Amino acid sequence: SMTSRPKLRILNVSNKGDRVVECQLETHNRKMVTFKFDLDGDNPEEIATIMVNNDFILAIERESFVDQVREIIEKADEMLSEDVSVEPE
- DSSP state string for the chain: -------EEEEEEEESSSEEEEEEEE-TTS-EEEEEEETTT--HHHHHHHHHHTTSS-GGGHHHHHHHHHHHHHHHHHHH---------
- What residues pair up with 20 in beta bridges, in sequence order? 14, 38
Residues 48 and 66 sit within 8 Å (Cβ to Cβ): yes
Which of 60, 62, 70, 61 shows the shortest CA–CA distance to 23? Answer: 70
The number of folded domains in the chain is: 1
Question: Experimentally, how was this structure solved?
Answer: X-ray
Q: Which domain holds residue 10?
A: 1-89
Residues 63 and 3 sit within 8 Å (Cβ to Cβ): yes
Resolution in A for the shown PDB structure?
1.6
